[PDB]
Coordinates of C-alpha atoms and ligand atoms in Angstrom, one line a residue:
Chain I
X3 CA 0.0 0.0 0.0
X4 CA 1.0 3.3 -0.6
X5 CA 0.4 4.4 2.5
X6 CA 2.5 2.7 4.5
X7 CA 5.4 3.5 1.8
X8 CA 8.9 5.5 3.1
X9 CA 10.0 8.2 1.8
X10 CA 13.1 6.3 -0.2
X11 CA 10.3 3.5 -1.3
X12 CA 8.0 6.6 -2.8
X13 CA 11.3 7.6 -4.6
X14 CA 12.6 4.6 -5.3
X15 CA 8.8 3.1 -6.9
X16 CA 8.5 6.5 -8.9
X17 CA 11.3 6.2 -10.1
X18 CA 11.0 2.7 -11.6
X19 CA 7.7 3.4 -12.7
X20 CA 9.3 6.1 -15.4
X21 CA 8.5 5.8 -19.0
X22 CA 10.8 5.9 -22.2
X23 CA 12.1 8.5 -24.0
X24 CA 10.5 8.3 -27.4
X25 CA 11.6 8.8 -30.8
X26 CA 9.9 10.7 -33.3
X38 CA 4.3 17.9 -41.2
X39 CA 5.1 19.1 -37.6
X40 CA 1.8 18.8 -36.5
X41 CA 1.6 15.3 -37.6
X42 CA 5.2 14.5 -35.9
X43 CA 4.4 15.9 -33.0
X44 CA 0.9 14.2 -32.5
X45 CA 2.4 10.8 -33.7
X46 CA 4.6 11.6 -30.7
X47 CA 2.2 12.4 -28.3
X48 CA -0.4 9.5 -28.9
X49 CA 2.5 6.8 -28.6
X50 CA 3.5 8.5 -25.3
X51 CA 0.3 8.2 -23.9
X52 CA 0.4 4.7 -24.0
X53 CA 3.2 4.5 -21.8
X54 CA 1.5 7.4 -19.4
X55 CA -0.8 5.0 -18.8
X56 CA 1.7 2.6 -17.3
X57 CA 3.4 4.6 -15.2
X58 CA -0.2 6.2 -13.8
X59 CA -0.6 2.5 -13.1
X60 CA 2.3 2.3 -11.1
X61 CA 1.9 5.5 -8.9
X62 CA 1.6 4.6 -5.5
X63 CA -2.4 4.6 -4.7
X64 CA -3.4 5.7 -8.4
X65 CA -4.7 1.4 -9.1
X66 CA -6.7 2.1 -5.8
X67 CA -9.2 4.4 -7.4
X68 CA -12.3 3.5 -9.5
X69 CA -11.6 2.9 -13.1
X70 CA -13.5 5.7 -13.8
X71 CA -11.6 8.1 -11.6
X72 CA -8.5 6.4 -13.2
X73 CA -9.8 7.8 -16.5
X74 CA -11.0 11.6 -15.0
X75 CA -7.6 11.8 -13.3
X76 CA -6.1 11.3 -16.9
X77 CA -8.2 12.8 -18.8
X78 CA -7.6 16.3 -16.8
X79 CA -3.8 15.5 -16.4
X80 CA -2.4 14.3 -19.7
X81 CA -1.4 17.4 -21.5
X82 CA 0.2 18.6 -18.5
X83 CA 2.3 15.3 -18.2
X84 CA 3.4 15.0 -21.5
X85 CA 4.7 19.1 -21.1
X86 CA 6.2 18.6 -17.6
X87 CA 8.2 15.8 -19.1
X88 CA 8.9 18.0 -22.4
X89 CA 10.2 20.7 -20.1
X90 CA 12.4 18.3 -17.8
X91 CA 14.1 17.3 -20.8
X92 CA 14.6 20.2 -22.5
X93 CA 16.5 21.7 -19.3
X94 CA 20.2 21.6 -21.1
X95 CA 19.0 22.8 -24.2
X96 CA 18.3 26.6 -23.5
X97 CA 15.9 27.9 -26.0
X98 CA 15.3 24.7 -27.3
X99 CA 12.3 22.2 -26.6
X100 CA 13.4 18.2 -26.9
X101 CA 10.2 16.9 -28.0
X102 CA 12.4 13.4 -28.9
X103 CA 16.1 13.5 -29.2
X104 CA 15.3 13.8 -32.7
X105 CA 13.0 16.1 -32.4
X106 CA 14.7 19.7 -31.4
X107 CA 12.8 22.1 -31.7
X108 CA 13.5 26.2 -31.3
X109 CA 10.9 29.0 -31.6
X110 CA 11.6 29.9 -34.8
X111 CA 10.4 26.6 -35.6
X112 CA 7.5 27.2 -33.7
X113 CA 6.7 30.0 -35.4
X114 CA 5.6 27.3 -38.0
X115 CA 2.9 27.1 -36.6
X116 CA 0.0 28.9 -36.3
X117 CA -1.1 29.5 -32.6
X118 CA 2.5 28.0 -31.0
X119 CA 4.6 30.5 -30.2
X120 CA 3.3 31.5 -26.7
X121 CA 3.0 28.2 -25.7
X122 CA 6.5 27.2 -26.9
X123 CA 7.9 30.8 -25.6
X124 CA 5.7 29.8 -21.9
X125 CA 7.4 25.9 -22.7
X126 CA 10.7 27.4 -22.8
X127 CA 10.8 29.3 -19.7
X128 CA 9.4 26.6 -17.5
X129 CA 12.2 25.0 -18.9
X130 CA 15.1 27.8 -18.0
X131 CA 13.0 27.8 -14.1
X132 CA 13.6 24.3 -13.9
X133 CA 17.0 24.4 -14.8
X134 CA 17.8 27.7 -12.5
X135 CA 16.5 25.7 -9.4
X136 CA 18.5 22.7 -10.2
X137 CA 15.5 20.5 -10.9
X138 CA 16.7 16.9 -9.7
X139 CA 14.8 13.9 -10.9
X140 CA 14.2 12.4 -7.9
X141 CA 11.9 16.1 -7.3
X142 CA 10.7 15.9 -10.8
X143 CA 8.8 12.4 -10.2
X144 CA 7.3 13.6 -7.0
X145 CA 5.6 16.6 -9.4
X146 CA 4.8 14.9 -12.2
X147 CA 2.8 12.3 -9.3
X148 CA 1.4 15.2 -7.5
X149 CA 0.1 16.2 -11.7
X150 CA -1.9 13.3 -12.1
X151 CA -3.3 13.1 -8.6
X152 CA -4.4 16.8 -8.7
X153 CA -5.8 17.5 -11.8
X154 CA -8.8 16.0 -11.8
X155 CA -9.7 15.5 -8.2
X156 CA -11.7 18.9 -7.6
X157 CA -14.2 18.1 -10.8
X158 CA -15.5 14.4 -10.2
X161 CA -21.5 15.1 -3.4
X162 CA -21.5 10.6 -3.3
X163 CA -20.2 8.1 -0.7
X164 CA -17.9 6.5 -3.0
X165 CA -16.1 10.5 -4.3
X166 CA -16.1 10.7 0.1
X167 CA -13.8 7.9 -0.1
X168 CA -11.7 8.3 -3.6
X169 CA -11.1 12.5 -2.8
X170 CA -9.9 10.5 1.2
X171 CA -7.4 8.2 -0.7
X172 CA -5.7 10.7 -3.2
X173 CA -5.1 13.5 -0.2
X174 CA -3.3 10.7 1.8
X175 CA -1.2 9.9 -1.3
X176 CA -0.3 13.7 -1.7
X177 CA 0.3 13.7 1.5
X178 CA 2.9 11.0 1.4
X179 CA 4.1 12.6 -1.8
X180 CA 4.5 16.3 0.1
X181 CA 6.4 14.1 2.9
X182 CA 8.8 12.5 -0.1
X183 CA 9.4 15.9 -1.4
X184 CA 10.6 17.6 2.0
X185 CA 12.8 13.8 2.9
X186 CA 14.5 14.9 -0.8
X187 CA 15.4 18.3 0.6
X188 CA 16.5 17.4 3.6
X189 CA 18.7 14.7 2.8
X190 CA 20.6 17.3 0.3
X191 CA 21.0 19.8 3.6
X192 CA 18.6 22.2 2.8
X193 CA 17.5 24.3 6.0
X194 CA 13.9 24.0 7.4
X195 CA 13.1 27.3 5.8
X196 CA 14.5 26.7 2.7
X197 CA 12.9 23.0 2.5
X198 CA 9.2 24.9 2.7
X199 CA 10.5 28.0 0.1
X200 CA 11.1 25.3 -2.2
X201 CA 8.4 23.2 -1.9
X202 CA 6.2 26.0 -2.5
X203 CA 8.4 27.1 -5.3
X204 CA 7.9 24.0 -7.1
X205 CA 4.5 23.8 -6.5
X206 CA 3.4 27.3 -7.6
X207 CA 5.4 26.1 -10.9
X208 CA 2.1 23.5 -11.3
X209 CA 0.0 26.3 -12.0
X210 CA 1.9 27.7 -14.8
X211 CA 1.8 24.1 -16.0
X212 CA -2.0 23.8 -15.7
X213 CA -2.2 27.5 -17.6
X214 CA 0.2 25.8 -20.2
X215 CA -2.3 22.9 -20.4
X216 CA -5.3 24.7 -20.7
X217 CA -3.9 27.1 -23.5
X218 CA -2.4 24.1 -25.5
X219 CA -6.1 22.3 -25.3
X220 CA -6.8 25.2 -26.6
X221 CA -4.6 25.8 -29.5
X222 CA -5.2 21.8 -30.1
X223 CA -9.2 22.1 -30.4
X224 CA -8.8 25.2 -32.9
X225 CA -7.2 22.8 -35.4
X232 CA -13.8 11.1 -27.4
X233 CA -10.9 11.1 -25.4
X234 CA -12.7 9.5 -22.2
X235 CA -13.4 5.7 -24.5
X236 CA -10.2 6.0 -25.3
X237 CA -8.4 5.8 -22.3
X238 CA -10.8 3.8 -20.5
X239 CA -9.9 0.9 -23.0
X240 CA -6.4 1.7 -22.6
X241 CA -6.6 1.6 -18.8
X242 CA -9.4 -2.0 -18.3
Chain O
X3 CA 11.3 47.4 3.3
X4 CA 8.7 44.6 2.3
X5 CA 11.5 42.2 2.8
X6 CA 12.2 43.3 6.3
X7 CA 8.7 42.7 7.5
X8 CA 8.3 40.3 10.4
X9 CA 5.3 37.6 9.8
X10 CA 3.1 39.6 12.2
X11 CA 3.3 42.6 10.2
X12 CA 2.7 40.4 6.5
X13 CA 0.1 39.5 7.8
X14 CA -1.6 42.6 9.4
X15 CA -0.6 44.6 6.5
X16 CA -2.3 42.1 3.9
X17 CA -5.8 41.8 6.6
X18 CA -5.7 45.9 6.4
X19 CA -5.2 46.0 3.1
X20 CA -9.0 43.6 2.2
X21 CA -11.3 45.5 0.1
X22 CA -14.5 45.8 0.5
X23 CA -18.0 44.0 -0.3
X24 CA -19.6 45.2 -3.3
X25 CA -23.4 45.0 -4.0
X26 CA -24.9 44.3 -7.3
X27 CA -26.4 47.2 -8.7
X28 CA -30.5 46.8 -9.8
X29 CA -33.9 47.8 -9.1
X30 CA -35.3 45.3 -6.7
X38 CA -30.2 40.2 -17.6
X39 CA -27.8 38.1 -15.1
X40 CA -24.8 38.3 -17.2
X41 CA -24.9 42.4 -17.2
X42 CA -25.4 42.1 -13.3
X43 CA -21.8 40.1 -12.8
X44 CA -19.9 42.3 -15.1
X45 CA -20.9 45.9 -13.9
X46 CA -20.4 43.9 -10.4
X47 CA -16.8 42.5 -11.7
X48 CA -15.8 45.9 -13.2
X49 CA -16.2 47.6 -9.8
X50 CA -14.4 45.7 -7.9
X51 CA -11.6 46.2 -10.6
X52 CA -11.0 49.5 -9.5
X53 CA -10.9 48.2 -6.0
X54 CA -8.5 45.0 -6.9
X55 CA -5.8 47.6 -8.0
X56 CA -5.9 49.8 -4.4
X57 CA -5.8 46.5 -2.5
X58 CA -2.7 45.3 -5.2
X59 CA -1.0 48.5 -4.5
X60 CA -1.1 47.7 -0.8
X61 CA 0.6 44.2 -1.2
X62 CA 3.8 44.3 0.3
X63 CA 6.4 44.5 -2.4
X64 CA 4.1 45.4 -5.6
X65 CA 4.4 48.9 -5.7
X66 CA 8.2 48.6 -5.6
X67 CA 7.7 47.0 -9.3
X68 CA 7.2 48.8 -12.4
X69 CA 4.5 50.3 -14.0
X70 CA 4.3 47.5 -16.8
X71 CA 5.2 44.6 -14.6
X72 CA 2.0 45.6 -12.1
X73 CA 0.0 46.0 -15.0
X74 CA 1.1 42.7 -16.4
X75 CA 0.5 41.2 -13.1
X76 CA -2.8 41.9 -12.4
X77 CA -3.9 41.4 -16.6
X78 CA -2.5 37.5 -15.7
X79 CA -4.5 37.4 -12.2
X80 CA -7.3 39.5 -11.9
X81 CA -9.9 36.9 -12.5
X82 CA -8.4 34.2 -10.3
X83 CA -8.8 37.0 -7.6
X84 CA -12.4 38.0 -8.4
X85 CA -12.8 33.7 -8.4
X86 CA -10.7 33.4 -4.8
X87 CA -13.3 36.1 -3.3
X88 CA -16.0 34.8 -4.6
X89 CA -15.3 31.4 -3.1
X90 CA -14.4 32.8 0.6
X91 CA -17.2 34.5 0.5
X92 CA -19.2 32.0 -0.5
X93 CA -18.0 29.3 2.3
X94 CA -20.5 29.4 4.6
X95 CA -23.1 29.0 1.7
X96 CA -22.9 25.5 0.7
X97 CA -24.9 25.0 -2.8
X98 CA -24.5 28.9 -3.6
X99 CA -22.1 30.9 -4.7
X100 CA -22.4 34.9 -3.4
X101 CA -21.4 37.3 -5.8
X102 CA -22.5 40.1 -3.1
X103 CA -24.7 40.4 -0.4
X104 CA -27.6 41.0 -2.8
X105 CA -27.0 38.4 -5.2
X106 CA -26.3 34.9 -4.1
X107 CA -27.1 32.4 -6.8
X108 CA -27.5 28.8 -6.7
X109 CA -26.7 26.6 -9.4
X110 CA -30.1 26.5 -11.1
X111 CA -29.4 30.3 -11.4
X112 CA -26.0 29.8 -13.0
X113 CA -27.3 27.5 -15.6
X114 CA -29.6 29.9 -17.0
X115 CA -26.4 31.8 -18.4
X116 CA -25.4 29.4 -21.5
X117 CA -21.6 28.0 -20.4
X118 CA -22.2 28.4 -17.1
X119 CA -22.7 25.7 -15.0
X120 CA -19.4 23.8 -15.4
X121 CA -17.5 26.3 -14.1
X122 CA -20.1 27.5 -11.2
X123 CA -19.5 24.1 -10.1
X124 CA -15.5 24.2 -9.9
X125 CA -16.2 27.3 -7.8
X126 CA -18.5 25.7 -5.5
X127 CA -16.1 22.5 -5.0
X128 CA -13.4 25.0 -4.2
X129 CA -15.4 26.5 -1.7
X130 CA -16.4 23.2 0.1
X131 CA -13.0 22.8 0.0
X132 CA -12.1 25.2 1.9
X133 CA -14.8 24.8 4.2
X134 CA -13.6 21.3 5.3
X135 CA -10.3 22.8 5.1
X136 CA -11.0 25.4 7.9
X137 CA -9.1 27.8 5.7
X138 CA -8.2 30.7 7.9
X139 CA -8.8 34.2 7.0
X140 CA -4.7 34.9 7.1
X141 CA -4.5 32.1 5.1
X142 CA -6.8 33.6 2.4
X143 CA -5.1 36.6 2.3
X144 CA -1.5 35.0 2.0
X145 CA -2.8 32.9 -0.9
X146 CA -5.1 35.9 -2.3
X147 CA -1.1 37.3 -2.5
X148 CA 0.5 34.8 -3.8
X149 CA -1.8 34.5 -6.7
X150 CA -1.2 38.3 -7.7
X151 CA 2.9 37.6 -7.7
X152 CA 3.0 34.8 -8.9
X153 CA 0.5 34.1 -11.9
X154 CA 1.9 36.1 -14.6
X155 CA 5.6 36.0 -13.8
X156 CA 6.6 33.6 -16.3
X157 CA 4.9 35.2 -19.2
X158 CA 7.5 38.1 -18.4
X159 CA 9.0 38.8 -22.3
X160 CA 12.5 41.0 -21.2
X161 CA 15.4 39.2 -20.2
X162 CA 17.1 42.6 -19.3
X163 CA 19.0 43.3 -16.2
X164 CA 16.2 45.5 -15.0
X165 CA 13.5 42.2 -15.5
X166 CA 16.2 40.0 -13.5
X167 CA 16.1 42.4 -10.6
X168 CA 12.1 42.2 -10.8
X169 CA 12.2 38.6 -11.3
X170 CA 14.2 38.5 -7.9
X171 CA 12.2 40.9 -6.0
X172 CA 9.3 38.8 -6.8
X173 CA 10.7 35.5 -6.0
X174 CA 11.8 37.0 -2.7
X175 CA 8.5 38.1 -2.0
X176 CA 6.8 34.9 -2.8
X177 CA 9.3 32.9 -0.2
X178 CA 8.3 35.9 2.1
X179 CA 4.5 34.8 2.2
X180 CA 5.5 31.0 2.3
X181 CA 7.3 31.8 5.7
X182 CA 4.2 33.7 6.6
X183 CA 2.3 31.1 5.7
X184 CA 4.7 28.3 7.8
X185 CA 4.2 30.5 10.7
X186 CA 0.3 30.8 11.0
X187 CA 0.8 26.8 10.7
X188 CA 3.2 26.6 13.5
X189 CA 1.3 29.5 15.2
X190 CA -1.8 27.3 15.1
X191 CA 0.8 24.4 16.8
X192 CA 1.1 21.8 14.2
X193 CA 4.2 20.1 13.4
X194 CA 6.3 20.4 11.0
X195 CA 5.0 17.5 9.0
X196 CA 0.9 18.9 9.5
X197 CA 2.5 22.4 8.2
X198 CA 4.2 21.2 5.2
X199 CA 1.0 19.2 3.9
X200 CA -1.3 21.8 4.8
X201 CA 1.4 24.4 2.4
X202 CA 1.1 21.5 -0.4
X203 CA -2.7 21.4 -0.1
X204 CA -3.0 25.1 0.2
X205 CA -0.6 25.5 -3.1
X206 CA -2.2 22.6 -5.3
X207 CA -5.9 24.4 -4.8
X208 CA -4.1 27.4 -6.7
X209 CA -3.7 25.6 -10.2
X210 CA -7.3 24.9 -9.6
X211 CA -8.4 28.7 -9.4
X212 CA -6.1 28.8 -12.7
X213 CA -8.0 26.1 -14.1
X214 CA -11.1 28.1 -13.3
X215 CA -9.7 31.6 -14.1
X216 CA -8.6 30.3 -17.8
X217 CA -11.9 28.2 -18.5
X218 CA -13.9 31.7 -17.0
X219 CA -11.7 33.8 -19.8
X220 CA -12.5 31.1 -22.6
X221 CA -16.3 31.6 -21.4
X222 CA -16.1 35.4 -21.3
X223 CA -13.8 35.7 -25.0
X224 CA -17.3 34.0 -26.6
X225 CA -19.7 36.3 -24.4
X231 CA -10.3 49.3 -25.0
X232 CA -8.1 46.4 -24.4
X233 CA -7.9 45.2 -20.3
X234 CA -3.7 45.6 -20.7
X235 CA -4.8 49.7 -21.3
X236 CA -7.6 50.0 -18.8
X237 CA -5.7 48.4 -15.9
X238 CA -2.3 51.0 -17.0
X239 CA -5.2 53.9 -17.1
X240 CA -6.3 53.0 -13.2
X241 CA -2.6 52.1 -11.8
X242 CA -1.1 55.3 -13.5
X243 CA -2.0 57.8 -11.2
X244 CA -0.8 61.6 -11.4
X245 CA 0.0 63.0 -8.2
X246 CA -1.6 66.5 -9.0
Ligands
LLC301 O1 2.6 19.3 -30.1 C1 2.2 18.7 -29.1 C2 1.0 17.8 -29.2 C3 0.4 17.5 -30.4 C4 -0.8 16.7 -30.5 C5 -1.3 16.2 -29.3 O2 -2.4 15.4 -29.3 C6 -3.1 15.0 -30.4 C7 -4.4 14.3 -30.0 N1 -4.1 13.0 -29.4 C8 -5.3 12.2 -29.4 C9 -5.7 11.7 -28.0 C10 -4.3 11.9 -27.2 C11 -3.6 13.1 -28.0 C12 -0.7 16.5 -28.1 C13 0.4 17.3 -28.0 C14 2.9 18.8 -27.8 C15 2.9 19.9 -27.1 C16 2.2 21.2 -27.4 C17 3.0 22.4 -27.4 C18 2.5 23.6 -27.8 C19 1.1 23.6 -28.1 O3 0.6 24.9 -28.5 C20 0.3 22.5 -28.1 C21 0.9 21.3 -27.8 S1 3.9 19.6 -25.7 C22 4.3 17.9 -26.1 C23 5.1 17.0 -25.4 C24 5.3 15.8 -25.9 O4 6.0 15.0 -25.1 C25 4.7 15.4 -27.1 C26 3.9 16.3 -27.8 C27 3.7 17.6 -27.3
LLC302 O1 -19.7 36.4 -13.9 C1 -18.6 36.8 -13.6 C2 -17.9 37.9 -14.4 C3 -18.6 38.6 -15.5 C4 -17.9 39.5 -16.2 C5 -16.6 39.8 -16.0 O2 -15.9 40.7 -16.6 C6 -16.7 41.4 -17.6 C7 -15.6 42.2 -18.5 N1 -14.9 43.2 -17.8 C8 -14.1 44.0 -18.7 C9 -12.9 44.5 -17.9 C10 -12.6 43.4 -16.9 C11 -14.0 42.6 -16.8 C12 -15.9 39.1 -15.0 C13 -16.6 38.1 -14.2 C14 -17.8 36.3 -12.4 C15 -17.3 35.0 -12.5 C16 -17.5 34.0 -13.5 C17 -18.1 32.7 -13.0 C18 -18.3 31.7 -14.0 C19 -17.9 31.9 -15.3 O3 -18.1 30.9 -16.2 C20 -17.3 33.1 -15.7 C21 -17.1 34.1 -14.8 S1 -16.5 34.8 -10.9 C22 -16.8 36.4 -10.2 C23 -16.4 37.0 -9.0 C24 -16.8 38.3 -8.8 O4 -16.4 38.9 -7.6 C25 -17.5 39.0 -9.7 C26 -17.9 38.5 -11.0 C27 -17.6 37.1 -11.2

């Protein structure tokens, strides 16, 4: 359970639970990309602590809500020694010139790229970047599922965040950070989910201008 | 000097700087009533942003860009602590609580209406403080449109700093209501983390809102016009 998880078990499972890198007109490229890498999204949500737990229907809310934002969090984490470029693959570099390409991009790409340079002035560590990419797909959907059974679900996934928040702090304690610096940063990197969520939300956006649900409940029975 | 202040003083400077309650404005459609309600309490949002510790200390173009990222996520965190002790309802002002019936007579509506009144059960069960609102209320003005900064310029960097200093300012704040209130460190970590997680919900709800109100002078020029006083 993951409940009764450590900190270093949190870190250690999330860790094993990450998916491949993927290898890659740009439109098509990129959504060629994007559909193979939600396969493997859907494995590793399977293998975040607590996520199996849940109703196969809040399995598929949870994703549903999240997926753009884990498929940019990961874009950003990899693009983090490639200032002013995005990695989409490592055959797919991408700067915003060449997202000026396309119509309806550029913010998005220009917003991608400076998550990107945050990440990279805060010395990001992996270990960190599993805990938010967890804390992503727990979070997103949770607010939008009054029922006995949403009493219970909503109770499960604040327990796992919980554990998660615990996992973060154990992180930045073990690399000597002071109290006060441990909570500055946590908040720091969790403020940095909202820009992600606005990312998310303007992509959908940009996406639409150019169902879902069946889909990944197949994916996820 | 917003640097220097002590918790305490954060805090009482952030609960004096609250604006008031508005009331809708009709003889006793809906849509109308919301927005001359929202545009009124514009002009108040920029007094109370002006008194956030640290804001005024930024430029003209940086407050404006602030606010232009943030205003409606602050108009939506009112709303909701307002609205806290009315489960099922959502009060827009004294004079105009609505229930969800109500918000589904405006067509796109209802989905969002509900995201606001999940938020505000939230923090209901949450027992979010009043100190707590205003931290967060805070937070939201800083920190929503800082990464949509375009300069790179020394000058930006410098801004860019002040801000992130402030921001770590209210999470100590924050830490110390927690601590304050006596619960350990662990409780006052998780209660930061669930505090800080129901913020990219407001800008869920703050970008779905603009989406809504885009297919109901440019806001970038009317917010410059109100923070660009003379002194005359
Ligand atoms: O360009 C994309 C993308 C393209 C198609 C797409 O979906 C097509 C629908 N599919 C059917 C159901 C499931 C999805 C998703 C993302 C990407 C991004 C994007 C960046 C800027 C923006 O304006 C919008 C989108 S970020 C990103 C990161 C990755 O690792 C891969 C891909 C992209
Ligand atoms: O209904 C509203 C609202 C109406 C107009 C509006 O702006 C009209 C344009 N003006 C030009 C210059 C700047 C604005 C803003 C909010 C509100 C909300 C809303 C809730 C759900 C939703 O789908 C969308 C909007 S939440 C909220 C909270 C408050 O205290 C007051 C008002 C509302």
């Amino acid at each position: 359970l993951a409940l009764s998880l450590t900190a270093d078990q949190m870190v250690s499972a999330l860790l094993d639970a990450e998916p491949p890198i993927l290898y890659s007109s740009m439109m098509g490229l990129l959504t060629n990309l994007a559909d193979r890498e939600l396969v493997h999204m859907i494995n590793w949500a399977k293998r975040v602590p607590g996520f199996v737990d849940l109703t196969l229907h809040d399995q598929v809310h949870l994703l549903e809500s999240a997926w753009l934002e884990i498929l940019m969090i990961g874009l950003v984490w990899r693009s983090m020694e490639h200032p002013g470029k995005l990695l989409f693959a490592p055959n797919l570099l991408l700067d915003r010139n060449q997202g000026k390409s396309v119509e309806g991009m550029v913010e998005i790409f220009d917003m991608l790229l400076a998550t990107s340079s945050r990440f990279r002035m805060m010395n990001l560590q992996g270990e960190e970047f599993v805990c938010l990419k967890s804390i992503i797909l727990l979070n997103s959907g949770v607010y939008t599922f009054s029922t006995l059974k949403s009493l219970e679900e909503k109770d499960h996934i604040h327990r796992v965040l919980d554990k998660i928040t615990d996992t973060l702090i154990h992180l930045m304690a073990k690399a000597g950070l002071t109290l006060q610096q441990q909570h500055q940063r946590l908040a720091q990197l969790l403020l940095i989910l909202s820009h992600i969520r606005h990312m998310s939300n303007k992509g959908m956006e940009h996406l639409y201008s150019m169902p879902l649900y069946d889909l990944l409940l197949e994916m996820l029975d």
